[PDB]
Each structure stands twice: as structure tokens, then as C-alpha cells.
Amino acid sequence: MDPEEILERAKESLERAREASERGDEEEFRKAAEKALELAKRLVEQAKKEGDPELVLEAAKVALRVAELAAKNGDKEVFKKAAESALEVAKRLVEVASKEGDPELVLEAAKVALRVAELAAKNGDKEVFKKAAESALEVAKRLVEVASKEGDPELVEEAAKVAEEVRKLAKKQGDEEVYEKARETAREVKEELKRVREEKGGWLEHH
Numbered sequence: 001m002d003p004e005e006i007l008e009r010a011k012e013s014l015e016r017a018r019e020a021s022e023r024g025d026e027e028e029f030r031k032a033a034e035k036a037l038e039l040a041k042r043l044v045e046q047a048k049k050e051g052d053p054e055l056v057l058e059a060a061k062v063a064l065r066v067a068e069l070a071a072k073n074g075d076k077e078v079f080k081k082a083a084e085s086a087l088e089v090a091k092r093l094v095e096v097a098s099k100e101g102d103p104e105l106v107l108e109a110a111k112v113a114l115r116v117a118e119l120a121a122k123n124g125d126k127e128v129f130k131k132a133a134e135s136a137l138e139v140a141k142r143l144v145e146v147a148s149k150e151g152d153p154e155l156v157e158e159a160a161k162v163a164e165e166v167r168k169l170a171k172k173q174g175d176e177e178v179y180e181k182a183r184e185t186a187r188e189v190k191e192e193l194k195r196v197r198e199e200k201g202g203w204l205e206h207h
Contacts, residue, residue, distance in 0.1 A: 010039035053096045060089040103146040103155045110139040133178045137185045153196045160189045
């Protein structure tokens with residue numbers, strides 16, 4: 001299956017789930033949501049067979065969409081499954097994007113995790129909030145590594161912004177543990193940002 005074809009089928013399954021949700025057909029909603037997640041997972045594996053990182057990001061976005069739908073119709077089991085899928089796919093995207101020296105897509109993985117965190121915060125799911133927030137912080141740390149290797153202080157700054165957004169979210173959610181992890185991550189990222197700026201600005205002054 002062409003990965004664009006998998007993605008099209010995944011989107012078709014999402015729309016069935018939406019339509020079923022509207023009708024109050026809970027069984028059909030759950031079957032279509034499951035199928036969308038299954039196809040998103042298949043898209044990740046095909047994207048690997050073909051060496052296409054952008055498609056892994058599209059898979060993650062399918063899972064996010066299933067999670068939002070589930071949130072809206074109050075289905076906690078499908079919400080948690082779709083959230084877990086989105087985070088799992090985000091982690092796969094970091095690994096692919098890191099190998100190809102593509103820090104822009106590593107940042108996109110962090111944005112997926114942040115959106116899961118926001119969804120979980122909105123819906124009062126503390127367990128998923130913690131998972132997604134921790135994932136976002138971990139991806140910010142990998143983004144610093146990737147970005148520093150390419151001498152790109154701008155993407156290091158983006159990693160700082162990810163940590164700061166986790167910090168602010170956690171304070172609003174009252175999650176002290178995640179707050180302190182986010183603040184420590186942000187401190188480390190900002191120290192590495194100073195170093196990377198000074199390294200570049202130094203070799204610029206030199207030349």
C-alpha cells in the first residue's frame with residue numbers, strides 16, 4: 001500500500017468515527033477509531049520501509065485527531081489509547097528525524113506531545129497529561145542535541161520554548177512534579193542556548 005493511500009484510508013476511518021459519534025453509535029465509533037489508529041501505526045511502518053519521515057508526522061496527527069474526537073464524546077478508553085498512540089508515534093518520529101539530521105521534524109514531534117498534554121489538561125486526564133508533558137521535555141532535550149550539532153541556536157531556542165510551555169501548563173494543572181522537571185529542563189536548555197550562541201557569535205567575530 002502506497003503510504004498516501006494508507007493515510008487516505010486512515011482519514012476515511014476517522015470520518016466514519018465522527019459520523020458514528022454524531023449518531024450515538026458507540027460500537028461503530030469505537031471500531032472506526034480503532035481502525036484509524038491501526039492504519040496510523042501501519043503508516044509509520046511503511047514510512048520506514050520507504051524512508052519518509054514526513055509521513056510519520058502525518059500518522060501522529062491522525063492519532064491526535066482520534067484523541068480529540070474521543071475527548072469530545074467522553075470515551076476515556078479511546079482517548080487514552082489514541083493519546084498513547086500519538087506519543088508512541090512522536091517518539092518514532094524523533095528517532096527517524098534525528099538520524100537524518102532534521103531538527104525541524106524533531107520539533108514537530110515535540111509539538112505533537114504538547115498538543116496531547118493540552119488535550120489531557122482540558123479533559124482532566126492527569127495520567128495522560130504527565131506522560132505527554134514528560135515526552136515533550138524529552139523531545140526538547142533531543143532537539144537541543146540535534147540542533148547544536150547543526151550549529152542552529154534558533155532551534156535550540158525553540159526547544160526552550162517547548163519546556164517553557166510545559167512549565168506553564170503544569171503550573172495551571174497544579175502538577176508540581178512536572179513543573180519542577182520542566183523548569184530544570186528549561187534551565188539546562190537555556191544554558192546550552194547561551195553556549196551555542198556564544199560559539200557561533202564567537203566564530204562570527206573571528207571572521
